[PDB]
Amino acid sequence: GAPATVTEQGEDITSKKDRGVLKIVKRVGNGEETPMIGDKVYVHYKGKLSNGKKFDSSHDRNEPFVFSLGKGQVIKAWDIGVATMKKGEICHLLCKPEYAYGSAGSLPKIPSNATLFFEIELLDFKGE
Amino acid sequence: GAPATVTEQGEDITSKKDRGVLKIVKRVGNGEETPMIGDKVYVHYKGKLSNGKKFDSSHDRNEPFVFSLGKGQVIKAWDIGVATMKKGEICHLLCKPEYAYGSAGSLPKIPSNATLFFEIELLDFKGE
Ligand SMILES: CC[C@H]1CN([C@@H](C)C(=O)O)C(=O)[C@@H]2CCC[C@H]1N2S(=O)(=O)c1cc(Cl)cc(Cl)c1
Numbered sequence: 462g463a464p465a466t467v468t469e470q471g472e473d474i475t476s477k478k479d480r481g482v483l484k485i486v487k488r489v490g491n492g493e494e495t496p497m498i499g500d501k502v503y504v505h506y507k508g509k510l511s512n513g514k515k516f517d518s519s520h521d522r523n524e525p526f527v528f529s530l531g532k533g534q535v536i537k538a539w540d541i542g543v544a545t546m547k548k549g550e551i552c553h554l555l556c557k558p559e560y561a562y563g564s565a566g567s568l569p570k571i572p573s574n575a576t577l578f579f580e581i582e583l584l585d586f587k588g589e
Numbered sequence: 590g591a592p593a594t595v596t597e598q599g600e601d602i603t604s605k606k607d608r609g610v611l612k613i614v615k616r617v618g619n620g621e622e623t624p625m626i627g628d629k630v631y632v633h634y635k636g637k638l639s640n641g642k643k644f645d646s647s648h649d650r651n652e653p654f655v656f657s658l659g660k661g662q663v664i665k666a667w668d669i670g671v672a673t674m675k676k677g678e679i680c681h682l683l684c685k686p687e688y689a690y691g692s693a694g695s696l697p698k699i700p701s702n703a704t705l706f707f708e709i710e711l712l713d714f715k716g717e
């Protein structure tokens with residue numbers, strides 16, 4: 462499925478080149494610029510575990526998820542992955558546990574040592 | 590009704606004591622602990638405008654709402670108010686626009702300078 466395709470075909474976008482964050486662009490954005498660290502970024506996302514099941518989606522709530530990029534306020538895979546995106550882009554990210562919730566997880570809905578898959582759309586970004 | 594009761598009897602839980610976030614506990618919860626900064630909190634909620642209009646409910650879409658406390662990834666009134674809640678608690682919050690969507694609003698759903706009312710149930714929270 463979509464997670465496996467990212468496993469197979471995805472660019473390693475980690476600075477460790479440790480394969481901890483893998484990416485496929487699914488829709489090229491109209492934007493020319495990525496967001497900077499500290500920008501307020503507006504995204505829609507869908508998240509799945511390795512067994513393929515949805516664990517979360519901003520679409521379900523019909524309002525974007527907004528965070529400050531590159532501040533450590535989301536999992537490391539998101540700070541790395543969203544920083545690579547242009548306005549309007551949709552990507553698939555695969556996030557190894559070391560770039561997500563690690564050995565502890567976040568029960569109930571993230572197991573220990575879980576690899577996470579996201580479909581992320583960058584809607585907009587604004588300066589701090 | 591409920592919004593009037595919180596106006597009259599709600600505690601001002603803001604540090605500035607500006608009546609920006611007023612709270613009444615409607616159903617007492619279980620255990621004495623409250624969530625820490627960064628904890629994932631799981632809630633159900635019902636939200637209304639000052640004219641009585643229901644603007645959103647997590648029950649309507651049968652989807653508990655999950656957020657990370659104290660990161661500014663929800664409106665300020667929620668970071669302040671939910672931090673005071675115990676597991677199983679239901680509270681009523683009344684939120685001045687300075688602690689919600691401000692002069693901009695989130696149009697048309699949330700008008701400019703809107704005071705918001707919530708009934709919030711804290712289902713669970715998970716530490717890290
Ligand atoms: C809950 C939303 C958020 C959780 N966080 C931060 C804010 C956190 O764990 O503190 C995350 O980094 C990632 C990516 C941004 C959206 C959400 N997650 S998430 O992996 O989809 C997620 C993680 C958990 Cl533990 C629960 C849910 Cl419902 C969703």
Ligand SMILES: CC[C@H]1CN([C@@H](C)C(=O)O)C(=O)[C@@H]2CCC[C@H]1N2S(=O)(=O)c1cc(Cl)cc(Cl)c1
Pocket residue numbers: 522523524525527636644645654662663664667695698699705
């Ligand atoms: C929709 C869920 C969420 C919206 N947000 C954030 C995430 C936002 O507007 O960016 C909120 O802070 C508050 C409090 C947490 C639950 C939701 N609201 S809300 O005031 O009910 C709300 C606000 C708007 Cl603009 C739309 C909807 Cl559908 C619901």
